[PDB]
Amino acid sequence: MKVLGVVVEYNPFHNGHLYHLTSARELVKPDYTIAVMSGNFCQRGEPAVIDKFARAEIALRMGVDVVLELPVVFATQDAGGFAFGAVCVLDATGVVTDVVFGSESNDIEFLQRVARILYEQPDEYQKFLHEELKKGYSFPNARKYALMRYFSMKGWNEEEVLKLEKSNDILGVEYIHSALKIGSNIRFHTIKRVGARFSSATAIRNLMREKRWEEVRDSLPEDSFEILMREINEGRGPVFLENMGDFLLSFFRLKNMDFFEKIHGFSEGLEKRFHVCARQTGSYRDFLECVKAKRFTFSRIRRLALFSVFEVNKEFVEKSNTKGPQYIRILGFTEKGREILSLMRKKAKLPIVTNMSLYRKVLEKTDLPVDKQLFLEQIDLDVKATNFYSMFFPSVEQRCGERDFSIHPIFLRT
Amino acid sequence: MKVLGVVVEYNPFHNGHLYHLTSARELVKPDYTIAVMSGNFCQRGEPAVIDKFARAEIALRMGVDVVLELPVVFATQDAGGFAFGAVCVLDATGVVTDVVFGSESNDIEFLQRVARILYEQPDEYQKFLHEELKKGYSFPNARKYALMRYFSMKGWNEEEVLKLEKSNDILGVEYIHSALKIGSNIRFHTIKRVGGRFSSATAIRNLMREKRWEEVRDSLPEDSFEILMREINEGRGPVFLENMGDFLLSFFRLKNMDFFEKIHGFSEGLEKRFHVCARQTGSYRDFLECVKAKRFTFSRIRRLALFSVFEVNKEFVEKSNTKGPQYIRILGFTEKGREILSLMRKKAKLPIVTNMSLYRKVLEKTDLPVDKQLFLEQIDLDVKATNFYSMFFPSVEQRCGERDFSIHPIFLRT
Ligand SMILES: Nc1ncnc2c1ncn2[C@@H]1O[C@H](CO[P@@](=O)(S)OP(=O)(O)OP(=O)(O)O)[C@@H](O)[C@H]1O
Ligand SMILES: Nc1ncnc2c1ncn2[C@@H]1O[C@H](CO[P@@](=O)(S)OP(=O)(O)OP(=O)(O)O)[C@@H](O)[C@H]1O
What we know:
Assembly: dimeric
PDB class: ligase
Entry title: Crystal structure of Thermotoga maritima TmcAL bound with alpha-thio ATP(Form II)
Structural class of chain A: alpha/beta
Oligomer: homodimer
CATH topology of the largest domain in chain A: Rossmann fold
CATH architecture of the largest domain in chain A: 3-Layer(aba) Sandwich
Number of strands of chain A: 8
Bound molecules: adenosine-5'-RP-alpha-thio-triphosphate
Chains A, B: Thermotoga maritima TmcAL
Radius of gyration of chain A: 21 Å
Strand content of chain A: 5-15%
Keywords: acetate ligase, ligase
C-alpha cells in the first residue's frame, strides 16, 4: 500500500499549503498521509507564529492523518540538515512510500540527476567544487558553479543548473540526496508551486503584524484561520521574532567569543561579529543589520542566534547529522490515523514517543539500537525550545508549565 | 593624615546616607574620603535603580572625594563575601586609615569582640560550630548558635549574640573580620542608625514605582534627587528588578540542574527548586515565591538568580574570596580626590584602573603580584554586568555601547 509523506512548517497553514497537500494526495492516491513538521521554530530562524500543537491540529483538519515533529536540531538548520532530518524521520516510520514537495521548476528528473551527482561525488565534480571554494565562493555558490562546470564537461546545458537558485528546488535536491545517503526506497515527486489568493507564509505573517485580518482570512483555509483566531483569543499568539529580540540581544551580551566558537554554524569571522554587534547595538533588528553583510543572509544569522541561545554546539549537530533523529515524536493523529500509527509501531526503525511523560521509559526499554545520549540531548532541545517559546505568549496566564508534557498528541475523530 | 573609607551601595543616595556620611566625617575628621560602591547590582540581588556612573557622581557631590567600584563578584555576594571584597579594596588603596559604618547596636567593642572570635577560631568555638553544622543548620545559623554557646562558656551574655541578627551589625562584624584576615590596620567605628525624612532605600524605590515623587523628593538630598530626575528624563531610569524578570525566568528555562550545580551559592536543594519553579511559573515574581521557603531569604534567592545569569561559578568565587579583588576601579573623583589618587599610585597594593580601554595594558605592565587570569575574569564580570544592565534602560536609544569603555571616571570640579 501507499503512504504519502510531506515535509512542512505551516507557519501559518495557508492556501498554498492546501494546494500542495491536495495535489500531493490526488497525484499519489495514498492510503494515508503523514507530515513531519517543524515545531515552535522554523528553518528561517523565526518562531512559529502559533505553536506546534495548534499547527498540528490544523494539519489534521486539512487532511493529514498523522503529524510528527521534526526535531529542533534539524528544523532550524540550513536546507541540507533540515532535509536530512526530515527524510530520516519519514523513512524511519517504516511505512512512507512516496514524498511530494512543491517545486519552482516542477522538474523531478532534473532534481534527481543533481542529487545523484552530489551523492556519488564524481572526482571531476569534487575537483571543480574545491577550486570554487578555494576561489572564496560560499558553499551554495561553489556547488552551483561546480555543477555548471560539470554539466558543461558532460555536454549538457549548464543553464539548467540555474534552477538551483530557487529555494524549494534546492530543498528538493537535498531531500533526494538524503534518501540516497540513508538508502531509502521512498519515491519523490514534485508539484508546481503557484502564486508567490496565494500569499507567502512570510507575507501573511506581515499582514498579521499590520493587523490586516481580512486579508489574512483571504489567505488561509477556514479551519486554519479559525485556529489562528483561537490562539490569539487566548493570548497564545501571534508570536513574532521581534518579541524575542531583547532576550536574544541581552543573552549575547552575556557571552564571549569562546562561547560562539563552540556553537554550530560559526565560521568566517561570525563569532567576532556576534560579539561586537551585540555590544554596539540596542535592538535585535539593529543587531541583525550589524552582523549582516554581503556574504551572510538574514536567515543564516537568525539561525545562528537560535543555535546560540539554545546552546546547540558543533559536536551535537555533527552527531545529529550523521546518526539522524533518534525518535519519532507524534504531535497528533486522527481516528483514521490510528490505523497507520498502529502499523508504524510494528515497522518503525526509531522509538515512537506519544506520551512525553514516558519518553525515558520508552528509551530504557526499546529494542532499537539508538544512541541514548544523543536521543536525550535531541529531545531535551525539543522541550527546551517549547518552554522558551511559551514565555513569549502574549498573555502571562498562558506561560506556565511544560507544554510538551501537559499537551498530549492532538486527536480528532473522523 | 587620615582617610575615611566607607562601604556603600547608595541605591539611591538618601537622607540616611547623608546622615551617615556627615556623622562619619565629623567623627574621623578625614583629610580625604573614599567610597567603595556596588556597581549596577546590589547585595540584595537587585539592579541599582540608576546606574553606577550616576550614583558615583551623586556620591562626589555629597562629599566623597574618590569613588571605587566594588567588583560584582563581591557586590552581589552575601555579607561575608561583600565585606571581604569591600575591605580588601579599601585596604588596597594603601591610604585608608578609618572606616565608619552605620550600626544598630552602635557598639564597636561588641562587634570587635565577635570578629576576634571568628578570626582566632577558639578550640571550644570550633567544636560548637562542628556540632551545629550537623543538625542540618546552615552556616550563618550554625555560627550564630556556636557563638551563643561560646559566649555562655566564657561567662558573657549570649543574648548579645542576637545583635548579629541585625543586618548592619552583621556587615560590621564581617568588615572587621575581613580586616583581621588580611592584616589591615584600618580603625573601624560605628555610628548609630537613625529613623518622614528618613525612609529606607527599598521604601524609596517603591515610592518611585508608585510614582510619588514628592515623597521621593522628601527622602533625598537635592543633588541626589536632581540626578535621579536627570537619568529618568534621559531614559536611563528607573531600572527595577521586575524589568529584568522575564529575561531571568526565560533564561532559567534554558538550563538544567547540572548548570545550577556549578553556580556559586547553590545548596540545600535550591538547584531543583530553581529548575522546577522556572518551568511551573509564568513570571519572575511568581518564580521567586515558588522558590521561597522558610529556610530561604528572598535576597539569597535573588542573588542566586544573578549568579546564574552571569555564570558566576563556584571556583571563580572561591578564588575571589581567597585572593580578593585584583584591581582598584575608579568610578569618579573630585579635584580634591585627584590629590589622594596621586598618593594611591605610590602606595596602592593593587593595580589602579581609570581608563578601561587601558586595563589590559595596566595588567601587562604592573609589578604587583596579582593573579592575572583572576584579574581578567573579575573585570570581565564587571563589564558584563554593566552591558546586561544597560539593555534595561527604558529608552531604546540608550542601550547601545559598552558604558564601561564609553564613560570615563566622573570628574567634579570644586
Ligand atoms: N503556493 C504554493 N503552491 C504549491 N505548493 C506550495 C505553495 N506553498 C507551499 N507549498 C508547498 O507546501 C509544502 C509545505 O510548505 P512549507 O510549510 S515547508 O512552507 P514554504 O514552502 O516555505 O511556504 P512559503 O514560506 O509560503 O514559501 C512544501 O512542499 C511547499 O513547497
Ligand atoms: N538611616 C541611617 N542611619 C545611619 N546610617 C545609615 C542610614 N542609612 C544608611 N546608613 C549607612 O550609610 C552607609 C551606606 O549605606 P548603604 O548604601 S550599604 O545602604 P543601606 O544601609 O543598606 O541602606 P538601607 O537599605 O536604606 O538600609 C552604611 O554604613 C549604612 O549603615
